[PDB]
Amino acid sequence: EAPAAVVTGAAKRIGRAIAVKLHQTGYRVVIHYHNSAEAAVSLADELNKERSNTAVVCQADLTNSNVLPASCEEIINSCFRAFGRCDVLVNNASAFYPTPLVKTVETQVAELIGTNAIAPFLLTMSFAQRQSNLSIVNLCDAMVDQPCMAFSLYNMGKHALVGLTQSAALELAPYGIRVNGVAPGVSLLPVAMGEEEKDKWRRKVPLGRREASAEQIADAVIFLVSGSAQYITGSIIKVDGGLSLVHA
Amino acid sequence: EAPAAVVTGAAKRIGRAIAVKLHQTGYRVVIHYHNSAEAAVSLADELNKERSNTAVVCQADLTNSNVLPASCEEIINSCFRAFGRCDVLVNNASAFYPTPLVKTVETQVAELIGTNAIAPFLLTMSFAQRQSSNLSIVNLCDAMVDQPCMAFSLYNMGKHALVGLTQSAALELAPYGIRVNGVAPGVSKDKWRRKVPLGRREASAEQIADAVIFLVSGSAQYITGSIIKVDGGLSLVHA
Amino acid sequence: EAPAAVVTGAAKRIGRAIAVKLHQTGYRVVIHYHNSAEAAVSLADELNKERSNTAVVCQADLTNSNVLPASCEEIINSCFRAFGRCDVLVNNASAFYPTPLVKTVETQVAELIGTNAIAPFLLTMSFAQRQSNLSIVNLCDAMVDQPCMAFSLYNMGKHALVGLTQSAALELAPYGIRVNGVAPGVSLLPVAMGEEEKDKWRRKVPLGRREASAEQIADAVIFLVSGSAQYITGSIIKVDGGLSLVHA
Amino acid sequence: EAPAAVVTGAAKRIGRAIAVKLHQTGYRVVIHYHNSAEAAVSLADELNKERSNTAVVCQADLTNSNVLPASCEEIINSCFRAFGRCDVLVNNASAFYPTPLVKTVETQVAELIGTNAIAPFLLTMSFAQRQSNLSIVNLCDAMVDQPCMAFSLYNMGKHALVGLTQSAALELAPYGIRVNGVAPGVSLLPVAMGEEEKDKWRRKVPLGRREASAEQIADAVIFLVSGSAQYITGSIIKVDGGLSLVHA
Numbered sequence: 001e002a003p004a005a006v007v008t009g010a011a012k013r014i015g016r017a018i019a020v021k022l023h024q025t026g027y028r029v030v031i032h033y034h035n036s037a038e039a040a041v042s043l044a045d046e047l048n049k050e051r052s053n054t055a056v057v058c059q060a061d062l063t064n065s066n067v068l069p070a071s072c073e074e075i076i077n078s079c080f081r082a083f084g085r086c087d088v089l090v091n092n093a094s095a096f097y098p099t100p101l102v103k104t105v106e107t108q109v110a111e112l113i114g115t116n117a118i119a120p121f122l123l124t125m126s127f128a129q130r131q132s133n134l135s136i137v138n139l140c141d142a143m144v145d146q147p148c149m150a151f152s153l154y155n156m157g158k159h160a161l162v163g164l165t166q167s168a169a170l171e172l173a174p175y176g177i178r179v180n181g182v183a184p185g186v187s188l189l190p191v192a193m194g195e196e197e198k199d200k201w202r203r204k205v206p207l208g209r210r211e212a213s214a215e216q217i218a219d220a221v222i223f224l225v226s227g228s229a230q231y232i233t234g235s236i237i238k239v240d241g242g243l244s245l246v247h248a
Numbered sequence: 249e250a251p252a253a254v255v256t257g258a259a260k261r262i263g264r265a266i267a268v269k270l271h272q273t274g275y276r277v278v279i280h281y282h283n284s285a286e287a288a289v290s291l292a293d294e295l296n297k298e299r300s301n302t303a304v305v306c307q308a309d310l311t312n313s314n315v316l317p318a319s320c321e322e323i324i325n326s327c328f329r330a331f332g333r334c335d336v337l338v339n340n341a342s343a344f345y346p347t348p349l350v351k352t353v354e355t356q357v358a359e360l361i362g363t364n365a366i367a368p369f370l371l372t373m374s375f376a377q378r379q380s381s382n383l384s385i386v387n388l389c390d391a392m393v394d395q396p397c398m399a400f401s402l403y404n405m406g407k408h409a410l411v412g413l414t415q416s417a418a419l420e421l422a423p424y425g426i427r428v429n430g431v432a433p434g435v436s437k438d439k440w441r442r443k444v445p446l447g448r449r450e451a452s453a454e455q456i457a458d459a460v461i462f463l464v465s466g467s468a469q470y471i472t473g474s475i476i477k478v479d480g481g482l483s484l485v486h487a
Numbered sequence: 488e489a490p491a492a493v494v495t496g497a498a499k500r501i502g503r504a505i506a507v508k509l510h511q512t513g514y515r516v517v518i519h520y521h522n523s524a525e526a527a528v529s530l531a532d533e534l535n536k537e538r539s540n541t542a543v544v545c546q547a548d549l550t551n552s553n554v555l556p557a558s559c560e561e562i563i564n565s566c567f568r569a570f571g572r573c574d575v576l577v578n579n580a581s582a583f584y585p586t587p588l589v590k591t592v593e594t595q596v597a598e599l600i601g602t603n604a605i606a607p608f609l610l611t612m613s614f615a616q617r618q619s620n621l622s623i624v625n626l627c628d629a630m631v632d633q634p635c636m637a638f639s640l641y642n643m644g645k646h647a648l649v650g651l652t653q654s655a656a657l658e659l660a661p662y663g664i665r666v667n668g669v670a671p672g673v674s675l676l677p678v679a680m681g682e683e684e685k686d687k688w689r690r691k692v693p694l695g696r697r698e699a700s701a702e703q704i705a706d707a708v709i710f711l712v713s714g715s716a717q718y719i720t721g722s723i724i725k726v727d728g729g730l731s732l733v734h735a
Numbered sequence: 736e737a738p739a740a741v742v743t744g745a746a747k748r749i750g751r752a753i754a755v756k757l758h759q760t761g762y763r764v765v766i767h768y769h770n771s772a773e774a775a776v777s778l779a780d781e782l783n784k785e786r787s788n789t790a791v792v793c794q795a796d797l798t799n800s801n802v803l804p805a806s807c808e809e810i811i812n813s814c815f816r817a818f819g820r821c822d823v824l825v826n827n828a829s830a831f832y833p834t835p836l837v838k839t840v841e842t843q844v845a846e847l848i849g850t851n852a853i854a855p856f857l858l859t860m861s862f863a864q865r866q867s868n869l870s871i872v873n874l875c876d877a878m879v880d881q882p883c884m885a886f887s888l889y890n891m892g893k894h895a896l897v898g899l900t901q902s903a904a905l906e907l908a909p910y911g912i913r914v915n916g917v918a919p920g921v922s923l924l925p926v927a928m929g930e931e932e933k934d935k936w937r938r939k940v941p942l943g944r945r946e947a948s949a950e951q952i953a954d955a956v957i958f959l960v961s962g963s964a965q966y967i968t969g970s971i972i973k974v975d976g977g978l979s980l981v982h983a
């Protein structure tokens with residue numbers, strides 16, 4: 001059989017491009033989504049028209065809560081119920097917004113630490129418990145050590161995720177499960193953000209003065225789950241066009 | 249008058265050494281304690297014999313809950329009530345235990361992420377909100393963050409998150425004159441002692457406290473976003 | 488129309504596996520060597536048997552000295568003379584031996600800092616001066632923050648190479664030249680090392696209790712030079728089986 | 736009697752503030768200088784005025800060459816000749832100038848890698864070979880991972896100095912010698928810089944929008960050599976007012 005992958009937050013943007021590229025590489029995919037129900041089903045539609053019975057969707061809120069363990073368990077079970085196996089997990093889903101030090105605070109903690117770190121941890125536990133080229137890829141952030149002003153909790157979540165990547169690589173290595181991260185710099189800039197602000201960011205990037213395409217991010221995920229990365233674990237590949245090297 | 253410090257988890261071990269040493273330097277201190285009332289009060293007793301009314305205790309569970317925010321605001325308020333000011337926050341309290349990937353898990357999260365990272369973040373917000381002054385926060389980090397103990401995932405995540413906080417907070421609070429730094433102990437088992445380059449022994453708590461003292465001093469007035477390792481070289485030793 | 492690559496120290500072990508895998512991907516190769524003439528020629532003969540006129544050898548000492556600049560310029564020149572172009576430089580050649588703080592020391596400096604850091608810098612200058620998927624890959628070391636006892640100069644050269652990787656990424660990005668590193672852990676243990684000591688090192692590797700093959704290192708090099716790594720620069724991929732995550 | 740320290744490049748700016756504060760703290764000091772003969776001699780005068788026989792000068796070029804080991808050996812020898820002991824080495828001397836990838840190149844290598852890295856290594860070997868609270872402090876660079884463009888060789892020298900810090904910390908620990916670093920951001924801007932340009936660097940510094948005074952860098956050095964730092968070795972304290980945290 002074809003291997004199977006779970007991609008969290010795969011309805012739009014980078015997670016979609018990852019799901020598509022794994023699909024094109026011959027994976028069956030679980031497309032997880034939270035709110036983007038239309039975009040999820042439609043993507044699964046396109047993929048199933050390319051090969052029947054090779055994409056399903058799965059809805060879950062990945063905010064931290066006393067039911068988060070069961071939703072993460074459920075995401076993983078969805079892959080085994082659809083495909084009989086689960087080879088790859090890509091932790092892509094992520095909340096992003098300011099939490100100035102100077103939504104209630106408990107809800108921000110719940111969404112920014114929950115989605116960025118606790119859900120990846122619970123998903124990793126269930127993926128491991130339900131188990132060959134097994135691997136987990138976490139989408140980290142190339143700018144973790146030069147953070148955006150007023151994004152403390154997002155930054156805390158992404159650092160926690162680097163910690164999980166290292167801890168899990170070490171603890172799951174004996175079972176043959178590799179864990180690695182991909183750390184984008186600036187990739188798809190929200191059309192939400194304006195055009196002048198968009199160009200401000202583009203100008204900062206050494207390699208081409210442009211943001212990464214979603215495809216460029218997905219290419220590095222594909223390498224890490226590939227047979228070419230069989231000895232790579234605990235590694236985080238930056239895909240940032242040199243942005244993390246530029247001083248203030 | 250004299251500056252004032254909050255130290256979390258101050259009843260015992262490293263938090264105690266920090267509270268004593270800040271007190272010897274002339275700080276008034278809040279000794280925060282969860283379960284250790286007797287030890288906290290005994291220490292406040294000792295400090296107030298040295299100088300009257302320079303040490304109060306403050307009870308709070310720093311588990312993450314819907315009440316954590318209120319608990320953290322109260323720790324900071326304790327200091328302003330007792331002393332009229334709060335110059336230093338030392339985020340020392342911390343839960344430590346394994347969480348194998350292969351207590352409910354959500355209880356482990358509330359303690360290992362709540363105590364180690366979320367309470368520091370909420371205390372930092374309260375400290376800053378409530379503000380020749382010398383304001384600083386010092387976070388107790390871990391020198392072994394990049395070579396973690398097997399099966400210590402959540403703890404390791406919490407300490408990494410604390411490093412992120414240290415950096416984000418240093419950047420955001422710098423305009424307010426508040427410095428934010430970290431101290432990362434190693435071992436502070438003869439297996440362990442023997443691995444340590446510098447003299448085959450664990451640090452004393454007092455050696456941890458010495459680095460804290462430096463970071464709060466006027467000798468460290470340009471330092472922020474820095475994490476001083478106090479590990480006797482342990483993190484440099486390969487497998 | 489085939490691109491061309493220089494691999495330094497290409498006659499044996501990891502540099503040989505890199506040259507072979509670049510060749511297999513369609514590159515013409517300069518096989519640089521120092522002392523290993525027979526192994527170098529024999530590799531070029533094999534590659535040229537596969538595809539005529541696709542491999543040449545180039546002899547040079549990469550120790551630091553007043554002639555090192557001209558040697559490095561000639562290595563690069565040899566690629567343009569043989570193939571009309573030079574698209575990839577792999578800085579793989581490296582001396583390694585102890586230098587206790589407690590050969591003259593200046594020869595040890597010349598060899599450990601020259602081969603490991605200064606020759607890379609001079610090659611990178613020549614490569615960029617003589618200039619499309621252009622990229623340089625430096626072979627770094629995953630254990631650079633937990634160094635071997637009494638290897639100060641080696642460790643200094645490898646840290647200097649990290650700095651070069653970062654500096655040259657930033658400065659060559661505007662010319663579209665990407666610069667990245669591959670940091671092995673333990674790979675291809677010396678055939679001469681007694682099996683009981685090899686075992687000590689293998690035992691420490693979480694992923695599989697085995698050293699990497701040379702080909703596993705080469706796989707990461709192939710990724711970085713490929714069209715899939717087009718937005719990656721200033722990155723260093725560790726290929727170490729999780730060894731740098733293991734505490735003492 | 737009083738402990739003794741060597742400070743390299745101590746005639747002016749940061750190394751002077753370090754020699755002063757060491758002396759204020761009770762040390763006898765060797766003020767190493769290269770060209771700054773007037774300033775060196777003047778400083779030792781001020782110090783000896785305050786406590787007789789507590790300061791000597793020692794001239795040396797710290798460029799890499801086949802005589803660099805003898806000069807480093809002599810700097811340390813001068814301390815033993817003047818004071819009978821040598822407790823502290825501060826590696827502060829350093830060249831800094833552009834070396835664009837696109838003075839011969841071999842002279843740049845000798846000065847930028849020699850002063851920043853090789854001389855510290857050789858000084859370290861001499862210090863250790865010649866041997867209460869023994870310690871070495873290397874002056875590193877907070878910006879080493881976000882380098883100034885066109886400063887490759889300087890950046891390579893500073894990264895090498897970090898490696899030396901760690902390698903020597905590990906190797907010299909069993910002899911009771913601690914090795915640590917202090918990494919300034921921007922400190923004491925030169926008067927040879929435009930109002931415009933000084934304000935450019937100043938505006939970036941989060942903590943007070945101002946460079947460090949030399950005194951602020953010396954303060955950290957004092958701490959690492961003090962008995963309050965007896966368990967600290969292998970550590971590098973950034974003294975940069977937050978500058979390394981600021982993104983592009």
Ligand SMILES: NC(=O)c1ccc[n+]([C@@H]2O[C@H](COP(=O)([O-])OP(=O)(O)OC[C@H]3O[C@@H](n4cnc5c(N)ncnc54)[C@H](OP(=O)(O)O)[C@@H]3O)[C@@H](O)[C@H]2O)c1
Nearest residue numbers: 009013014033034035036061062063092093094139186187
């Ligand atoms: N984009 C960049 O330039 C960049 C830079 C650095 C790092 N990254 C990392 O790369 C990854 C993908 O980036 P992106 O820009 O594609 O991210 P994105 O568009 O912000 O969001 C990814 C998905 O996360 C899901 N999500 C958000 N909150 C959730 C919750 N409470 N429960 C469940 N799912 C939730 C959303 O799914 P629904 O739409 O179904 O609600 C969303 O589609 C992220 O991990 C990000 O932090 C990206």
Ligand SMILES: NC(=O)c1ccc[n+]([C@@H]2O[C@H](COP(=O)([O-])OP(=O)(O)OC[C@H]3O[C@@H](n4cnc5c(N)ncnc54)[C@H](OP(=O)(O)O)[C@@H]3O)[C@@H](O)[C@H]2O)c1
Nearest residue numbers: 257261262281282283284309310311340341342388435436
């Ligand atoms: N000791 C080491 O070798 C070492 C190594 C690496 C890092 N560190 C870091 O150094 C710091 C101090 O270490 P230590 O060994 O002194 O730590 P510790 O003895 O385990 O604990 C510090 C204090 O934290 C408090 N604490 C724990 N859970 C709490 C909760 N849910 N609510 C409120 N308070 C809670 C406890 O207070 P009560 O007793 O009042 O209940 C405890 O006495 C920690 O941040 C730690 O991770 C230490």
Ligand SMILES: NC(=O)c1ccc[n+]([C@@H]2O[C@H](COP(=O)([O-])OP(=O)(O)OC[C@H]3O[C@@H](n4cnc5c(N)ncnc54)[C@H](OP(=O)(O)O)[C@@H]3O)[C@@H](O)[C@H]2O)c1
Nearest residue numbers: 496500501520521522523548549550579580581626673674
């Ligand atoms: N193998 C590992 O586990 C490992 C671990 C960490 C890092 N690395 C890095 O990976 C790269 C490849 O490693 P390896 O184990 O294959 O290395 P290797 O066997 O030690 O040697 C690489 C080649 O370097 C060339 N070389 C050495 N000194 C030279 C000089 N003065 N001038 C010119 N060339 C010289 C030699 O060419 P000739 O044979 O023709 O004389 C040698 O065969 C190196 O940069 C190494 O530091 C390897």
Ligand SMILES: NC(=O)c1ccc[n+]([C@@H]2O[C@H](COP(=O)([O-])OP(=O)(O)OC[C@H]3O[C@@H](n4cnc5c(N)ncnc54)[C@H](OP(=O)(O)O)[C@@H]3O)[C@@H](O)[C@H]2O)c1
Nearest residue numbers: 744748749768769770771796797798827828829874921922
């Ligand atoms: N200032 C900053 O903002 C900053 C930022 C990052 C790092 N640093 C580091 O902190 C340390 C001191 O900084 P600084 O700005 O005071 O540096 P500085 O003014 O540039 O120079 C320090 C001294 O090193 C000596 N030196 C230069 N070339 C030499 C050679 N060939 N032989 C012997 N000595 C030589 C010079 O001595 P003579 O004058 O006697 O010739 C010079 O006074 C340096 O290691 C520097 O890299 C400083």
Ligand SMILES: NC1=N[C@@H](c2ccc([N+](=O)[O-])cc2)N(c2ccc(Cl)c(Cl)c2)C(N)=N1
Nearest residue numbers: 580581582583628673674675676677678688
């Ligand atoms: N340049 C370089 N060379 C190799 C190396 C050292 C010794 C031998 N040997 O004796 O055959 C081979 C490679 N090397 C290395 C060092 C230790 C080990 Cl265990 C291995 Cl596999 C390679 C390294 N890091 N750099």
